[PDB]
mmCIF file of C-alpha atoms in Angstrom:
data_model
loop_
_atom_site.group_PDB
_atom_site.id
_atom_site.type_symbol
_atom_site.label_atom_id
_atom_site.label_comp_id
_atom_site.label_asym_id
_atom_site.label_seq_id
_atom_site.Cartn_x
_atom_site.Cartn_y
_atom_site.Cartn_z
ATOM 1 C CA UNK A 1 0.000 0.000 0.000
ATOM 2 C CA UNK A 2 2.281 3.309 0.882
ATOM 3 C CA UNK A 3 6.016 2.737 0.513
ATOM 4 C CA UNK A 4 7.892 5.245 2.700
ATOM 5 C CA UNK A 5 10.830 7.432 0.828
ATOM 6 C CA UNK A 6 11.947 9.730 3.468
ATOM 7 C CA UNK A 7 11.114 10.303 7.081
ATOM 8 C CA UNK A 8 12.002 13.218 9.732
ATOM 9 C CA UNK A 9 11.790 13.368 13.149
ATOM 10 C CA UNK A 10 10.992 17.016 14.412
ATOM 11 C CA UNK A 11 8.262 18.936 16.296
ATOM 12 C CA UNK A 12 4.929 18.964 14.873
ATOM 13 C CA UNK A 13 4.629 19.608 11.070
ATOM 14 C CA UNK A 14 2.024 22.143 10.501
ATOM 15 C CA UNK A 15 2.479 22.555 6.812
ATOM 16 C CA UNK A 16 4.216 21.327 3.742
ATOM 17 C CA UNK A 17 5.485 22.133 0.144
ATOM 18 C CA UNK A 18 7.171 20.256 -2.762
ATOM 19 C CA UNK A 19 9.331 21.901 -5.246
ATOM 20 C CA UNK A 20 7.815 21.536 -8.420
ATOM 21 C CA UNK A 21 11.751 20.121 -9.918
ATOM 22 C CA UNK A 22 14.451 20.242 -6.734
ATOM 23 C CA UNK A 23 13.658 17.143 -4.603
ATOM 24 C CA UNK A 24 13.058 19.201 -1.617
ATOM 25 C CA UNK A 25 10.220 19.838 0.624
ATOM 26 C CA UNK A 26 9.480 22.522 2.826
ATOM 27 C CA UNK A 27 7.700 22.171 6.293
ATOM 28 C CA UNK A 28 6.520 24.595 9.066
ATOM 29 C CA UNK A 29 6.196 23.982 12.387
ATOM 30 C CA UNK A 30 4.440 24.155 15.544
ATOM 31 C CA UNK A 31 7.839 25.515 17.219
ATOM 32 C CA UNK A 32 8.052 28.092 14.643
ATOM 33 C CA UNK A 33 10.798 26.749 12.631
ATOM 34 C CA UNK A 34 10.544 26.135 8.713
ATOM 35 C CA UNK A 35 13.056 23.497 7.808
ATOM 36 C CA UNK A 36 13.935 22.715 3.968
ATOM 37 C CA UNK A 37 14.687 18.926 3.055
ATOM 38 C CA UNK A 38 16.105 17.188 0.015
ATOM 39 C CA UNK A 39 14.530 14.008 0.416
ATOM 40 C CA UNK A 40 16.976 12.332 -2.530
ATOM 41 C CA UNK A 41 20.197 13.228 -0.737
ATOM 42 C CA UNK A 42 18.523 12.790 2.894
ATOM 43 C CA UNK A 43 19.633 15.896 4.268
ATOM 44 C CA UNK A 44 18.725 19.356 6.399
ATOM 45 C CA UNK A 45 19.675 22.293 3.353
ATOM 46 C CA UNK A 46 18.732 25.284 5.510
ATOM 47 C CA UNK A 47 16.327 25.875 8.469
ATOM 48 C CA UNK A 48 14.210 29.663 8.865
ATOM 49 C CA UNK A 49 13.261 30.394 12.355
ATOM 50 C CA UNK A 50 12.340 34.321 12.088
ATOM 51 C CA UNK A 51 8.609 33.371 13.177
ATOM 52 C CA UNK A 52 7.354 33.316 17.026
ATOM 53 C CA UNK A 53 5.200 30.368 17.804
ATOM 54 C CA UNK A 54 3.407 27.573 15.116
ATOM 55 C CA UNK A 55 3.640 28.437 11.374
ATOM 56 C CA UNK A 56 0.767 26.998 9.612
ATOM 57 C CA UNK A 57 1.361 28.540 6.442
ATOM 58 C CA UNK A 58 4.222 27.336 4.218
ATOM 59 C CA UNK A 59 4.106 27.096 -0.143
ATOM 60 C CA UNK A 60 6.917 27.371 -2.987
ATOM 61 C CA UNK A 61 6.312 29.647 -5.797
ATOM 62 C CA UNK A 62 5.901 27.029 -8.671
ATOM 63 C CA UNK A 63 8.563 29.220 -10.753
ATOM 64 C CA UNK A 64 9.925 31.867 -8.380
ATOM 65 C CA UNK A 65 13.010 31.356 -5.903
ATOM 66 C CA UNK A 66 10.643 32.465 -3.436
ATOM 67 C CA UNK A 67 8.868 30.456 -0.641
ATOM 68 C CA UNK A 68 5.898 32.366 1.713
ATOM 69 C CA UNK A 69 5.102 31.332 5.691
ATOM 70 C CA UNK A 70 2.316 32.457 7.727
ATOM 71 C CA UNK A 71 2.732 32.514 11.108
ATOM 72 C CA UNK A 72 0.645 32.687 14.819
ATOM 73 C CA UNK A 73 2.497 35.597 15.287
ATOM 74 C CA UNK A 74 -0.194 36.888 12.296
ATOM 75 C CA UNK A 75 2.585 37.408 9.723
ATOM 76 C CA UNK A 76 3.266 36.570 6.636
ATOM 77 C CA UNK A 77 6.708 36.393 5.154
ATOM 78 C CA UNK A 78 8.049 36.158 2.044
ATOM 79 C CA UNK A 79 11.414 34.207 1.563
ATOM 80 C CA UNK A 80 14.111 33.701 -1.020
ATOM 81 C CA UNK A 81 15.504 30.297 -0.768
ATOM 82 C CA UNK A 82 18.710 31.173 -3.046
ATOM 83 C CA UNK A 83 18.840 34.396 -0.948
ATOM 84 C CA UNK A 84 18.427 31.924 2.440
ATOM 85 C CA UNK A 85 16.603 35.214 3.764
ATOM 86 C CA UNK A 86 13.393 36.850 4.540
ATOM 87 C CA UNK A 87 12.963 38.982 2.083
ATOM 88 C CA UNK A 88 10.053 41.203 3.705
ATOM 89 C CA UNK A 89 6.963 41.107 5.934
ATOM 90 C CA UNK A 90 3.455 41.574 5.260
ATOM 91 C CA UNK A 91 0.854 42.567 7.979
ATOM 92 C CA UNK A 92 -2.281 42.701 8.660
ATOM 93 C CA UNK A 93 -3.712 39.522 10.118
ATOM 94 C CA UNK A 94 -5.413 39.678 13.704
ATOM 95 C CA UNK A 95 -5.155 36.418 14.551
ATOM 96 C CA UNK A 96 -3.502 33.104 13.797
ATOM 97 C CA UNK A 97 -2.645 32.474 9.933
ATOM 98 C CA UNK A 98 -3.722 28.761 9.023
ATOM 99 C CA UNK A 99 -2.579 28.966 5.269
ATOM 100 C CA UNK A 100 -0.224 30.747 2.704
ATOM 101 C CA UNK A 101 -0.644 29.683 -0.970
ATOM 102 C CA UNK A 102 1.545 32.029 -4.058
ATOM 103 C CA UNK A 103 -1.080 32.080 -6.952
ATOM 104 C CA UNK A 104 0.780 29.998 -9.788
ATOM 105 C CA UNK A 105 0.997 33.005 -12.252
ATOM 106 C CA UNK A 106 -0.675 36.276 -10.772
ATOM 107 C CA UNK A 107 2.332 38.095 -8.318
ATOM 108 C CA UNK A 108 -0.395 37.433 -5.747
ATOM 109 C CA UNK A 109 -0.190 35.218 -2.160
ATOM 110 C CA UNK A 110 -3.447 34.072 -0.666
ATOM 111 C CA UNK A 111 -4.110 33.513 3.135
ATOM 112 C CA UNK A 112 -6.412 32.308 5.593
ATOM 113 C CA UNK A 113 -7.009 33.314 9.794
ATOM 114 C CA UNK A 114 -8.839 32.653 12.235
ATOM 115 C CA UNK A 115 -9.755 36.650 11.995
ATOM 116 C CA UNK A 116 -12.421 35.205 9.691
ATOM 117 C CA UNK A 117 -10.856 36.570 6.953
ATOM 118 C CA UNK A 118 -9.107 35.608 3.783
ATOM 119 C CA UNK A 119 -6.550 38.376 2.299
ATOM 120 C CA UNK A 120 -4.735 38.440 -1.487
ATOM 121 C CA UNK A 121 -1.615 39.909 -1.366
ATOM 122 C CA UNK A 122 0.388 41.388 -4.265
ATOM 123 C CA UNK A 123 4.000 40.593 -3.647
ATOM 124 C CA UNK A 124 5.209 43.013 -6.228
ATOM 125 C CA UNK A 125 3.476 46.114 -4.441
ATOM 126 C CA UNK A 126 4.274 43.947 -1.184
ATOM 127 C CA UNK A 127 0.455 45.214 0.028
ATOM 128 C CA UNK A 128 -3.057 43.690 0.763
ATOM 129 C CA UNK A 129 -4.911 43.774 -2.194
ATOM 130 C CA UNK A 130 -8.456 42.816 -1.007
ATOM 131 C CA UNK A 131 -10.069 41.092 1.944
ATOM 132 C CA UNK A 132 -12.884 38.680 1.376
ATOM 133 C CA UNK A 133 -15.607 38.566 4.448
ATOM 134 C CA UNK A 134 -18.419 36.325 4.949
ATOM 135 C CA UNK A 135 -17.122 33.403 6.943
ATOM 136 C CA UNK A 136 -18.093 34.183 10.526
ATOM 137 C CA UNK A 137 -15.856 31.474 12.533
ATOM 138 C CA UNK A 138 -12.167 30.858 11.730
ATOM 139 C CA UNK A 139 -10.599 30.324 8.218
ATOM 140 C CA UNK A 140 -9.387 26.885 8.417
ATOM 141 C CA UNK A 141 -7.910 27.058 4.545
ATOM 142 C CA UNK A 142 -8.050 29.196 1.435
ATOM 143 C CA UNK A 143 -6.599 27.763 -2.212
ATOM 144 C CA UNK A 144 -6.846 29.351 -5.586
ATOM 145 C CA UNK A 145 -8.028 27.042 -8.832
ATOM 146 C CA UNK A 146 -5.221 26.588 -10.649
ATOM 147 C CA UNK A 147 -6.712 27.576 -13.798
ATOM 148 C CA UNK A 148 -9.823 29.629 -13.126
ATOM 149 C CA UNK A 149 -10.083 33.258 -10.950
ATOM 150 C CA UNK A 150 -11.786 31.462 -8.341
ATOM 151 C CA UNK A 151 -10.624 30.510 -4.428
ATOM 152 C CA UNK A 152 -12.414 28.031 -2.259
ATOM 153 C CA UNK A 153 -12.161 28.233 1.136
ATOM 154 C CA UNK A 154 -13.252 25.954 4.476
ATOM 155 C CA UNK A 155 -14.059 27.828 8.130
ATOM 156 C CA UNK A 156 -15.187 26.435 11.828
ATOM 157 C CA UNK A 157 -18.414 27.993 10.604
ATOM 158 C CA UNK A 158 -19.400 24.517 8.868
ATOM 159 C CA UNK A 159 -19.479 25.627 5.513
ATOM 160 C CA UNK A 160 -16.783 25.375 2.106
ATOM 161 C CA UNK A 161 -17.049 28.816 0.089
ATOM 162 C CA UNK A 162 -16.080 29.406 -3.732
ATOM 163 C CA UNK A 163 -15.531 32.793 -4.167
ATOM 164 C CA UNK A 164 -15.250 34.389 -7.828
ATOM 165 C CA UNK A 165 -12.361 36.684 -7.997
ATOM 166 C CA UNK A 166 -11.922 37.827 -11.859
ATOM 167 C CA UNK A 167 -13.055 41.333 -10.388
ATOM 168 C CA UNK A 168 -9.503 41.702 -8.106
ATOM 169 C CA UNK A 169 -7.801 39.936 -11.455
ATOM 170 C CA UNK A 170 -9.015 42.996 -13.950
ATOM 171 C CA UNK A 171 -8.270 45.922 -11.265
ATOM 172 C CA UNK A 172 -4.997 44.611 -9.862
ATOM 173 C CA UNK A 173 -3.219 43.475 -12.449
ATOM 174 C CA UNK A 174 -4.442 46.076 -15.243
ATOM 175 C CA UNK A 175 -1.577 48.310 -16.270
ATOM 176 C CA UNK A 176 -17.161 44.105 -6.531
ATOM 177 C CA UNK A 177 -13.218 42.930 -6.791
ATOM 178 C CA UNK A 178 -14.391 39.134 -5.029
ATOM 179 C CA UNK A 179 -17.736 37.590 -5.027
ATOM 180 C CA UNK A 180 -19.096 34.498 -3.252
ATOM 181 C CA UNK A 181 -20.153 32.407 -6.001
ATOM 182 C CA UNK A 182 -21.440 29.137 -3.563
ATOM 183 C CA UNK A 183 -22.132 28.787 0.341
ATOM 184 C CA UNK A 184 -21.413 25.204 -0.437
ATOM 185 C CA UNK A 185 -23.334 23.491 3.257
ATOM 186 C CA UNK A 186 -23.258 19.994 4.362
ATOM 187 C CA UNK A 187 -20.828 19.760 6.615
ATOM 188 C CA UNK A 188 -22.773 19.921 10.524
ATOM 189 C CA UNK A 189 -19.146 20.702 12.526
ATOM 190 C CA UNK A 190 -16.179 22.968 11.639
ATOM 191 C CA UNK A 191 -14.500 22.072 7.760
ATOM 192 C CA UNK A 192 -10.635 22.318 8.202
ATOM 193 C CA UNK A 193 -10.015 21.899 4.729
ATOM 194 C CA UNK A 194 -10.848 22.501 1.007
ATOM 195 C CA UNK A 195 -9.129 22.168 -2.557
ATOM 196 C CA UNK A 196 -9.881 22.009 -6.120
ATOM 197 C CA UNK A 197 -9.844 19.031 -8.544
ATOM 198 C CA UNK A 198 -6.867 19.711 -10.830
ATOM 199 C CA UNK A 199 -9.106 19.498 -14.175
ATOM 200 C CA UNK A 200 -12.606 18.846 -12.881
ATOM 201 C CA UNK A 201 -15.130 21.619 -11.489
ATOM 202 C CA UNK A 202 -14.897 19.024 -8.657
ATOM 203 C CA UNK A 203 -13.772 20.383 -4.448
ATOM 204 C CA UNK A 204 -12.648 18.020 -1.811
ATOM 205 C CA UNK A 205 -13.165 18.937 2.160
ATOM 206 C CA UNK A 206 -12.293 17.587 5.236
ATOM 207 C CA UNK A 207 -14.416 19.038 8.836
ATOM 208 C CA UNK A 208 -14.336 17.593 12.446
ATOM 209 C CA UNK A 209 -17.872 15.785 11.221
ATOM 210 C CA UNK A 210 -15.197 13.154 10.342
ATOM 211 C CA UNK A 211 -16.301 13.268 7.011
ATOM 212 C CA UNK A 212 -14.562 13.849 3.441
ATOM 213 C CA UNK A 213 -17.087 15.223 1.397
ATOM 214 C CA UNK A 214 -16.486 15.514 -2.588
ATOM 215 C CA UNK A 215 -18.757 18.547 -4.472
ATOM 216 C CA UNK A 216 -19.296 19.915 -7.727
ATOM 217 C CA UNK A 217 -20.249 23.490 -9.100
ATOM 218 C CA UNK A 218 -21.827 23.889 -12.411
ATOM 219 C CA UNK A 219 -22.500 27.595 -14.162
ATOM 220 C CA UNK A 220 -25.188 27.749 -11.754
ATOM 221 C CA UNK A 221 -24.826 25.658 -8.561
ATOM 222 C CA UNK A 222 -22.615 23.684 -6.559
ATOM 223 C CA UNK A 223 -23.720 20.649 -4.691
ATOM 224 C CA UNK A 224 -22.380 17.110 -2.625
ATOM 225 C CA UNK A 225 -21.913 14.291 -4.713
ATOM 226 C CA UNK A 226 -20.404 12.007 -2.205
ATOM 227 C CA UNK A 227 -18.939 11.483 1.448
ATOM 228 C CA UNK A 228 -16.242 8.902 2.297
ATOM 229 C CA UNK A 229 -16.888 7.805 6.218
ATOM 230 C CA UNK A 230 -14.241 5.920 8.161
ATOM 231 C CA UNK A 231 -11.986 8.505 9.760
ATOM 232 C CA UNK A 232 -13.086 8.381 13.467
ATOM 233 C CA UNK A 233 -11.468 11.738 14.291
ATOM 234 C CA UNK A 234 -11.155 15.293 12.847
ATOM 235 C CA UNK A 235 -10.608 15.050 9.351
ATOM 236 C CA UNK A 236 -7.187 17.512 9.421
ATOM 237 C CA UNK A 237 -6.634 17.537 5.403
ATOM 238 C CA UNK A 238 -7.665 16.043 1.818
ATOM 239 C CA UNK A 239 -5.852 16.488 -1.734
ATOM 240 C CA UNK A 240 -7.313 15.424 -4.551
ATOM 241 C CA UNK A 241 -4.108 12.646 -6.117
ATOM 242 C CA UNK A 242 -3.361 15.001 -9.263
ATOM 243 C CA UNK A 243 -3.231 12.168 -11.861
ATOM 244 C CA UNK A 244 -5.118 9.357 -10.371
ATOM 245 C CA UNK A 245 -8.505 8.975 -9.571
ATOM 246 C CA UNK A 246 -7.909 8.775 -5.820
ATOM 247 C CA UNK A 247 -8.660 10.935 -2.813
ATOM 248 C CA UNK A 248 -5.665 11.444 0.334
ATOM 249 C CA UNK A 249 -6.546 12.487 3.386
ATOM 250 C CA UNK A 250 -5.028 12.097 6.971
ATOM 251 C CA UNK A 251 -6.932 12.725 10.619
ATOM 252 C CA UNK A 252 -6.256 13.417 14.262
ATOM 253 C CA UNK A 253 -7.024 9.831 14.766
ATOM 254 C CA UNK A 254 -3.608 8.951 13.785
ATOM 255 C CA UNK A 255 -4.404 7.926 9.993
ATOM 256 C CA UNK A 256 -3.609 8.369 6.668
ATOM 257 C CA UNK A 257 -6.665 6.878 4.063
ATOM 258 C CA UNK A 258 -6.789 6.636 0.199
ATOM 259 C CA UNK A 259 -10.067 6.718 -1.138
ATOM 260 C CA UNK A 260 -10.890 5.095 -4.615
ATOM 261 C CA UNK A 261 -13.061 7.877 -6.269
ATOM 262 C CA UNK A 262 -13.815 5.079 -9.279
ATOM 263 C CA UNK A 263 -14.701 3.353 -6.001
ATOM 264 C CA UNK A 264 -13.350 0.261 -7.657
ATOM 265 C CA UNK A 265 -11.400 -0.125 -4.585
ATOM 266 C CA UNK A 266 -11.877 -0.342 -1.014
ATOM 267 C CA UNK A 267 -10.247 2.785 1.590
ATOM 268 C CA UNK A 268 -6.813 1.922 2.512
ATOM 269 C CA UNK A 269 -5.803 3.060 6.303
ATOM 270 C CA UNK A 270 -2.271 3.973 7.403
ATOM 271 C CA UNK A 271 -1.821 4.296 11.039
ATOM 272 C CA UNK A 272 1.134 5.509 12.648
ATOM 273 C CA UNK A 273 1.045 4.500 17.157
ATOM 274 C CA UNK A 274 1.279 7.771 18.734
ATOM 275 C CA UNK A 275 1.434 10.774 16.289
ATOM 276 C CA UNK A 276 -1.965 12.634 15.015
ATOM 277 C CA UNK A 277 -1.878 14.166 11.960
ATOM 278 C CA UNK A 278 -1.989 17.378 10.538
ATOM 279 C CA UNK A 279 -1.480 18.061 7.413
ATOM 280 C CA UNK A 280 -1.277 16.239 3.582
ATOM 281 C CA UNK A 281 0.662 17.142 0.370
ATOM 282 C CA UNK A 282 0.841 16.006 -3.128
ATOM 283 C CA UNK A 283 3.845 16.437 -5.421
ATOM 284 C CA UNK A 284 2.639 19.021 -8.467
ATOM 285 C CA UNK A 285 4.112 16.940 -11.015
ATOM 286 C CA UNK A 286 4.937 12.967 -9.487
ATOM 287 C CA UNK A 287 3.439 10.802 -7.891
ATOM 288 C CA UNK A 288 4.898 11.697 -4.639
ATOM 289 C CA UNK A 289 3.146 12.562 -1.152
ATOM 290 C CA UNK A 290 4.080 13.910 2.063
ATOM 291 C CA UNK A 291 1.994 14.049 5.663
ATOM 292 C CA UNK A 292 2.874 15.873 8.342
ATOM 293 C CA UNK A 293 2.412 14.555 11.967
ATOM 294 C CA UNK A 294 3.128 15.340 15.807
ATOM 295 C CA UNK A 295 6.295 13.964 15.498
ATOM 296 C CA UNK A 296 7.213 15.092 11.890
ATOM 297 C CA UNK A 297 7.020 14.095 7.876
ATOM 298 C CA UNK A 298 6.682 11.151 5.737
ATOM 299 C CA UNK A 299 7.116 11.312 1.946
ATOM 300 C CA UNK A 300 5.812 8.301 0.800
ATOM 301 C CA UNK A 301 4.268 6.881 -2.510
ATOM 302 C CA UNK A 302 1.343 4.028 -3.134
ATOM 303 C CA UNK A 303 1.467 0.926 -4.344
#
């Protein structure tokens, strides 16, 4: 089932990110350290500890020397791993950041807090560039589409939003600016997690319902099409497998599980003895995962 390629022992892992063509990974942690691995050559390259307390937040830019953190501390920072330095701050958070994602193209970072808000940032002007309201409990997670102006986000306040934000596109990067498209509700406890199908108008979510619940948004709605039960705690993360037609996601109750979307398959369950887990991430171009747990990362594949 999951063969194991590299493991670290660490503090809890918070967050993750693969480099789209090093073989290194990023992760954040809960003591506010951001350590960068190449998993080929087994080895610590650098460690960042500028932050004060967890840092949820962590993402490459897919073609930038640049990586972004958010932070407890409510601050986002933007890094330059050739550089090995912070390159500047950005403020404006009020309480804990949960995620930073760079926007694959646009000079743009997207984040998440549990100030109920989600912010774009341009890194270019190195300001906030809008703030999207609506959610009324804690952003759990905030991800652009990687091909349309859209962002879906999960919140404590038991709902998934898709938010439409071709508006912001037009005014910021021209030489109202977001709009909630779908209140996507299902979920009956707080959602910790959302993402978009690579190539289908398809989101995945993870809430402490224990539930993974799988949607889909046409030009006019967006409804559930299925829910895989098993976890029996807090569903922490899911990621959609990029290239297979398979659903990851991992759970304070210790597990990783692979769902079979075909459903040709029955779940597979990976347990690890003592560590809960946190966080999930896929590889943007292999077939290549990581999970991050309370006593650090696993990059594994399936088999």
């Amino acid at each position: 089932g999951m063969l194991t390629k590299f493991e670290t022992k660490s503090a809890r892992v918070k967050g993750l990110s693969f480099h789209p063509k090093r073989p290194w990974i990023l992760t954040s942690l809960h003591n506010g350290v951001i350590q960068l691995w190449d998993y080929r050559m087994c080895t610590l390259i650098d460690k960042f500890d500028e932050h004060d307390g967890p840092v949820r937040g962590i993402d490459f830019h897919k073609q930038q020397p640049l990586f972004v953190s958010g932070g407890d501390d409510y601050k986002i920072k933007v890094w330059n791993y050739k550089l090995r330095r912070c390159l500047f701050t950005l403020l404006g958070h009020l309480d804990y950041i949960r995620t930073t994602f760079f926007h694959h193209e646009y000079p743009w970072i997207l984040s998440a807090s549990d100030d109920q808000t989600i912010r774009v940032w341009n890194w270019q002007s190195r300001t906030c560039v809008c703030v999207l309201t609506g959610h009324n409990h804690y952003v759990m997670c905030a991800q652009f589409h990687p091909t349309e102006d859209l962002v879906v986000s999960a919140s404590l306040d038991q709902t998934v939003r898709v938010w439409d934000i071709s508006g912001l596109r037009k005014k910021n990067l021209s030489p109202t600016d977001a709009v909630v498209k779908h209140v996507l509700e299902g979920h009956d406890r707080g959602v910790n997690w959302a993402a978009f199908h690579p190539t289908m108008p398809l989101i995945v979510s993870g809430a402490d319902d224990r539930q993974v619940k799988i949607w889909r948004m046409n030009e006019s709605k967006a409804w559930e099409v299925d829910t895989c039960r098993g976890h029996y705690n807090n569903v922490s993360c899911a990621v959609f497998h990029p290239r297979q037609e398979l659903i990851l996601s991992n759970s304070e109750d210790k597990s990783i599980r692979v769902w079979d979307m075909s459903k040709r398959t029955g779940v597979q369950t990976f347990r690890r003895d003592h560590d809960r887990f946190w966080v999930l991430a896929a590889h943007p171009n292999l077939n290549l995962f990581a999970a991050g747990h309370d006593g650090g990362m696993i990059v594994f594949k399936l088999e």
